[PDB]
Amino acid sequence: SPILGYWKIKGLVQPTRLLLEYLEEKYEEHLYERDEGDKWRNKKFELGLEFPNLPYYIDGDVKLTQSMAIIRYIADKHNMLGGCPKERAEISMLEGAVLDIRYGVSRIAYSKDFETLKVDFLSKLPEMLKMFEDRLCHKTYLNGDHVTHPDFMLYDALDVVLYMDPMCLDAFPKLVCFKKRIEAIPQIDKYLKSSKYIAWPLQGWQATFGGGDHPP
Amino acid sequence: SPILGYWKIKGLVQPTRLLLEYLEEKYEEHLYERDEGDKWRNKKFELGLEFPNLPYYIDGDVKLTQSMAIIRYIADKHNMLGGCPKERAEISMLEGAVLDIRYGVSRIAYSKDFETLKVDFLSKLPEMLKMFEDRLCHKTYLNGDHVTHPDFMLYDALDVVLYMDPMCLDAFPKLVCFKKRIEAIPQIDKYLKSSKYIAWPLQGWQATFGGGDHPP
């Protein structure tokens, strides 16, 4: 059975978790507590990973690393990456555009001067969010009436930037609906209420923002 | 004839440029000089891109942005991303690990505190390069006997980390090789010697590392 290894935190894997519940696929999680970093440094080179790292996916003669390939994989198995070249780049482009947000957040999340940085960030956030609203205009999801993995990716971003600035989505009623809509999906809804859900932390614990054991 | 738009620097599009030249695929470039940041903002939105940004690829209403979605597209348009979930995900994992090196460079390159940050990057670098030296054991190119896009990514990364530290590869002669090998491919080699080759800068002209109009 599938194995998904990562820190007991949202981070770089949340989308993959949410995409997994959607496909109601069975998988076993391997999470590393805040103080268990040695446990990782021990097994790190004893898993058969050609590029050791976190997260890692292992479900047979396949042992992956890199949150994208891992997720791109889970989806590619259920033919969710696109039927033709063009479309597959459309979804890879959504993939990218979302990361510039989610990663844009972790560039300044561990910095001690996170407060001074967040300004320019949230200053440029509107423009980015705007593109998605446009994309979502006349679509149930980023790619149409069918849930694509970048959706859980965008969903993850949104939720993260709401903790940073809960007002950022007021200017975008559409993105707020999107989020609600995603949460509506039966599987998703059972996850967010299930005991496997990981509401916090967002980033690793040592992080200024989104770090720490309990939300601020 | 397709169009590739970007700054006249190696930056995020070098791999892609190689690939294109590798498949002798014809195309034209829209090169933005150092002092043309306006000309871009002038056309940023009059191109019909759903996520205005750089670099951009455009041909018959195939409008793309995000260096990864782009490169993968050219690759996919030639059946080079993989023949199945497993080999496709393997190629994505290579993508990831290569960026974890190429990007590592750029995130500490624009900092004014570069000269002391590179020190901690170069210390970690070995462990990263190593993984690639292994992958290249009993293989001609990553992922096999046939050239893939991640091979052009690692090549750019290599070429860039050698400027930062001329001796980073001495402990990995297998990479020094892989690099000469790529440069040996007739199309590639003919390119590097061509006028279309952008030798410098590596990053945005403003960058501390690999910036400036000419290399030091």
Side-chain angles (χ1 to χ4, degrees):
Chain A
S1 177
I3 280 168
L4 180 57
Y6 196 57
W7 297 102
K8 186 167 176 295
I9 68 172
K10 290 196 174 188
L12 288 158
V13 85
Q14 202 56 45
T16 299
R17 292 202 184 95
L18 303 183
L19 167 78
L20 275 181
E21 303 291 289
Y22 180 64
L23 308 177
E24 194 193 329
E25 194 180 340
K26 176 176 299 175
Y27 75 94
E28 201 181 340
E29 277 179 304
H30 285 266
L31 304 65
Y32 289 98
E33 300 286 318
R34 178 176 188 167
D35 48 64
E36 307 182 312
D38 31 48
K39 294 186 184 301
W40 168 235
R41 287 198 294 289
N42 292 307
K43 302 182 59 179
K44 174 168 185 177
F45 298 93
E46 301 300 316
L47 283 178
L49 308 178
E50 313 200 343
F51 287 94
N53 205 335
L54 286 183
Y56 61 77
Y57 184 73
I58 301 189
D59 99 324
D61 53 320
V62 295
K63 297 178 166 61
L64 293 180
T65 274
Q66 301 299 309
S67 78
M68 281 305 87
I70 286 185
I71 194 176
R72 294 299 296 268
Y73 180 71
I74 305 194
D76 187 51
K77 278 175 67 187
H78 299 243
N79 297 287
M80 290 179 63
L81 310 183
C84 67
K86 173 175 305 177
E87 181 192 352
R88 279 164 359 212
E90 294 278 320
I91 178 213
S92 259
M93 177 175 69
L94 288 166
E95 175 178 292
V98 172
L99 289 170
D100 288 311
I101 287 173
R102 188 74 194 73
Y103 189 73
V105 178
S106 297
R107 288 180 106 187
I108 58 170
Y110 302 81
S111 157
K112 56 183 185 64
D113 294 338
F114 163 65
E115 301 306 319
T116 65
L117 300 178
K118 72 179 291 181
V119 181
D120 178 18
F121 176 44
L122 298 150
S123 192
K124 291 174 185 276
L125 180 46
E127 294 310 319
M128 299 175 166
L129 291 167
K130 185 179 184 297
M131 300 312 95
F132 293 99
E133 175 177 54
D134 298 318
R135 178 73 186 187
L136 284 191
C137 164
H138 295 108
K139 297 181 183 295
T140 302
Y141 303 101
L142 294 174
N143 207 339
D145 310 312
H146 288 352
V147 167
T148 322
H149 69 94
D151 281 317
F152 298 97
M153 269 182 68
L154 175 70
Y155 173 79
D156 181 54
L158 290 173
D159 167 64
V160 168
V161 309
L162 286 179
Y163 275 93
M164 188 185 278
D165 179 13
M167 291 178 56
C168 76
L169 297 184
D170 304 337
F172 311 103
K174 186 53 190 175
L175 305 180
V176 181
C177 318
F178 176 84
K179 176 175 166 63
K180 296 295 179 296
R181 187 185 296 86
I182 302 292
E183 310 173 306
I185 317 181
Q187 303 66 21
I188 292 320
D189 190 17
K190 170 179 292 181
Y191 188 47
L192 288 54
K193 286 174 175 56
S194 59
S195 63
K196 302 182 54 61
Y197 183 65
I198 300 186
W200 194 272
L202 276 51
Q203 313 287 321
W205 311 270
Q206 73 275 33
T208 287
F209 168 61
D213 308 335
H214 302 95
Chain B
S1 184
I3 281 179
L4 190 63
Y6 189 67
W7 305 104
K8 191 180 174 98
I9 80 179
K10 290 185 174 196
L12 288 166
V13 101
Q14 198 57 356
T16 283
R17 288 208 182 78
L18 296 178
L19 181 51
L20 293 181
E21 297 286 318
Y22 171 54
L23 297 69
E24 320 195 299
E25 194 181 310
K26 177 180 184 303
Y27 69 82
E28 319 175 313
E29 301 181 297
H30 263 285
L31 294 183
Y32 294 110
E33 304 289 334
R34 184 173 176 172
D35 58 359
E36 300 185 315
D38 292 328
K39 297 191 177 305
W40 165 228
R41 297 181 60 186
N42 277 310
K43 314 182 63 182
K44 177 159 185 153
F45 297 95
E46 75 188 323
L47 291 174
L49 301 171
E50 307 175 312
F51 295 94
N53 185 22
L54 282 163
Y56 64 75
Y57 186 69
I58 299 168
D59 89 287
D61 196 20
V62 180
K63 291 179 170 61
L64 289 176
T65 60
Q66 292 297 320
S67 70
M68 284 317 230
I70 299 176
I71 195 172
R72 298 177 69 50
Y73 180 70
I74 302 89
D76 214 353
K77 212 205 292 200
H78 289 63
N79 178 43
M80 287 187 61
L81 295 181
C84 73
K86 182 190 176 59
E87 182 187 56
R88 273 199 293 289
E90 194 84 359
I91 287 178
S92 280
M93 180 179 65
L94 294 188
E95 239 179 296
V98 181
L99 289 170
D100 282 333
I101 287 189
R102 187 62 189 75
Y103 187 56
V105 174
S106 299
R107 46 171 250 176
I108 57 169
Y110 296 87
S111 188
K112 181 65 173 183
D113 300 322
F114 175 58
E115 297 307 310
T116 64
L117 276 181
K118 79 178 168 185
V119 172
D120 182 64
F121 174 69
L122 293 177
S123 65
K124 303 297 180 178
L125 179 49
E127 286 311 301
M128 293 186 300
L129 291 192
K130 179 173 176 301
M131 303 298 99
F132 286 124
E133 100 159 286
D134 307 325
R135 177 72 181 193
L136 280 189
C137 192
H138 302 324
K139 281 171 191 275
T140 320
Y141 297 111
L142 310 163
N143 189 64
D145 248 84
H146 69 291
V147 168
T148 38
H149 62 107
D151 287 314
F152 287 104
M153 282 176 66
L154 174 56
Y155 175 84
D156 181 65
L158 290 190
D159 160 68
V160 149
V161 308
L162 282 183
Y163 271 97
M164 185 181 290
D165 173 29
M167 304 183 281
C168 57
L169 300 185
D170 305 342
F172 307 96
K174 296 185 68 176
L175 302 181
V176 175
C177 200
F178 170 90
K179 192 163 169 306
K180 290 172 190 164
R181 186 169 313 125
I182 292 300
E183 309 172 304
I185 307 205
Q187 310 84 57
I188 299 302
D189 170 62
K190 183 184 177 181
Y191 173 52
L192 301 179
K193 298 172 192 171
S194 84
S195 74
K196 292 188 293 299
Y197 176 61
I198 292 183
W200 186 277
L202 315 183
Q203 311 297 311
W205 300 274
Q206 308 77 15
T208 307
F209 176 62
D213 299 307
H214 301 336

